Design a protein around this ligand. Structure first.
Ligand SMILES: *[C@@H]1O[C@H](CO)[C@@H](O[C@@H]2O[C@H](CO)[C@@H](O[C@H]3O[C@H](CO)[C@@H](O)[C@H](O)[C@@H]3O)[C@H](O)[C@H]2NC(C)=O)[C@H](O)[C@H]1NC(C)=O
Ligand SMILES: *[C@@H]1O[C@H](CO)[C@@H](O[C@@H]2O[C@H](CO)[C@@H](O)[C@H](O)[C@H]2NC(C)=O)[C@H](O)[C@H]1NC(C)=O
Ligand SMILES: *[C@@H]1O[C@H](CO)[C@@H](O)[C@H](O)[C@H]1NC(C)=O
Ligand SMILES: *[C@@H]1O[C@H](CO)[C@@H](O)[C@H](O)[C@H]1NC(C)=O
Lengths: 48, 36, 48, 48, 241
């Protein structure tokens, strides 16, 4: 309803593969009052 | 100016338990809490 | 049906004329909750 | 990986959002952006 | 108190934060015709505080003030400035013909009356793209019974009576649930502990004894809670204890 909310988490992980079957929870990060329609998205690479 | 780059090769994996988050700005301990 | 279940939020946020119309929703449901408990306890007590 | 484009149309006809993250801070902005096709961030060693 | 108000099709939104909301100097500075609060009483605003506060701001014909009520449906509330049924906040409005209206007419305050769909609460649609209000398609600026926003309501000083430009501000706050940033004019006391007191933290009044916790709230948490959803613990806003 017109707010874009972000939550996040750091996870230290070893050589035990990826995306691990343990557990963790994300903390709130920001509440953005933007008031716009989001329908799609993309992500920024940064080759230097 | 812009340039077409960054080709993608998707694959599928199983997100076992991931992506739980603290649902509200409240503290709670020693409790099992139900949320929608 | 009240705006909060915490009776002090009602009493922080509203004046008497509409605070009492919210409080009475909680008096009604809480009182029904006791009436349920005491009926259940009388029904068990008669089995014990 | 440095951030995300979010929006409904991505071609300035309606607003859309950038999250951009660098070595020091984050910028968040919602605008009538025209995104071209492959958004990436072009950090370089600028001699001058 | 600024020169020109924003148009209702593109309502302006300011975030009020890191400050004291003494409203008394506003009420004695200027009259107002409307003063309707929702989920709060105007009487209590002295002893109270707010989490994040936004003012929504625009100018509108006085009839449409009725359309600013929580979740109400009508031409401005369906396509321009919808606010939800669960909006907690206050609406304040006053006549502007003494300030914005012009004897040659004013045309800066655009509004809309048609769209492809009824918009979502607190969403804004500034897009000038043409709307197909006729059955056949419409392209460019022209079209058979086609338009986008409609003509700005012409304001003349003597012309409108209940129908001239009224300035509107809507304060759409949330309260008592997060680390707060905008508080009423009531001054704080010192703390006391181990003694029974009428406490008030960020507007959360109660009666109890206060003690130092062993509990470890994360920086985003202001209140801690129990099985009856009453507040069991609190972070002291003057020292983060
Ligand atoms: C990462 O990208 C940021 C922009 O996306 C960039 O931020 C810019 O940094 C400079 C230097 O701190 C700021 O310059 C201003 O600093 C103060 C602000 O009060 C003024 O006194 C100065 O005169 C000057 O105007 C820019 O304002 C700032 N831009 C924004 C939008 O905040 C970072 O520097 C980038 N970091 C790296 C490592 O690339
Ligand atoms: C948010 O943006 C999307 C994308 O433009 C809108 O979805 C379109 O809505 C129209 C009208 O219902 C349809 O004709 C399109 O086919 C939809 N496209 C998609 C990809 O779903 C959506 O309606 C917008 N929401 C609001 C409230 O404006
Ligand atoms: C309100 O704005 C006018 C100019 O439009 C100015 O003359 C007046 O002093 C302002 N009022 C206050 C309280 O500053
Ligand atoms: C309030 O004042 C104290 C000193 O009495 C100070 O340590 C504290 O940072 C102040 N509160 C805030 C919100 O800065």
């Amino acid at each position: 309803d017109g707010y874009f909310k972000i939550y996040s988490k750091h996870t230290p992980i070893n050589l035990g593969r990826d995306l691990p079957q343990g557990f963790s929870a994300l903390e709130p990060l920001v509440d953005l009052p933007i008031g716009i329609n989001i329908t799609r998205f993309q992500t920024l690479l940064a080759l230097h | 100016q812009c340039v077409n780059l960054i080709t993608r090769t998707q694959s599928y994996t199983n997100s076992f338990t991931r992506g739980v988050y603290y649902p509200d700005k409240v503290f709670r301990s020693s409790v099992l809490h139900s949320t929608q | 049906g009240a705006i909060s279940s915490v009776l002090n939020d009602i009493l922080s946020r509203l004046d008497k004329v509409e605070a009492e119309v919210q409080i009475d929703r909680l008096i009604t449901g809480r009182l029904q909750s006791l009436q349920t408990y005491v009926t259940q306890q009388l029904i068990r007590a008669a089995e014990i | 990986i440095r951030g995300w484009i979010f929006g409904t149309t991505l071609d300035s006809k309606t607003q859309s959002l950038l999250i951009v993250n660098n070595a020091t801070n984050v910028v968040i902005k919602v605008c009538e952006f025209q995104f071209c096709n492959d958004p990436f961030l072009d950090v370089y060693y600028h001699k001058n | 108190n600024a020169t020109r108000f924003a148009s209702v099709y593109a309502w302006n939104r300011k975030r009020i934060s890191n400050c004291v909301a003494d409203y008394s100097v506003l009420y004695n500075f200027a009259p107002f015709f409307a003063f309707k609060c929702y989920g709060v009483s105007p009487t209590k605003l002295n002893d109270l505080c707010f989490t994040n506060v936004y003012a929504d701001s625009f100018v509108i014909r006085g009839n449409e003030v009725s359309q600013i009520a929580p979740g109400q449906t009508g031409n401005i509330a369906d396509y321009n400035y919808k606010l939800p049924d669960d909006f907690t906040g206050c609406v304040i409005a006053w006549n502007s013909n003494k300030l914005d209206s012009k004897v040659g007419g004013n045309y800066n305050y655009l509004y809309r009356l048609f769209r492809k769909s009824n918009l979502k609460p607190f969403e804004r649609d500034i897009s000038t793209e043409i709307y197909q209000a006729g059955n056949k398609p419409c392209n460019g600026v022209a079209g058979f019974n086609c338009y986008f926003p409609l003509r700005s309501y012409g304001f003349r000083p003597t012309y409108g009576v209940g129908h001239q430009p009224y300035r509107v501000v809507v304060l759409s706050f949330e309260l008592l649930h997060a680390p707060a940033t905008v508080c009423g004019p009531k001054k704080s006391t010192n703390l006391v502990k181990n003694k029974c007191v009428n406490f008030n933290f960020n507007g959360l009044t109660g009666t109890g004894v206060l003690t130092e916790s062993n509990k470890k709230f994360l920086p985003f948490q202001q209140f801690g809670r129990d099985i009856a959803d009453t507040t069991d613990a609190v972070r002291d806003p003057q020292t983060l204890e």
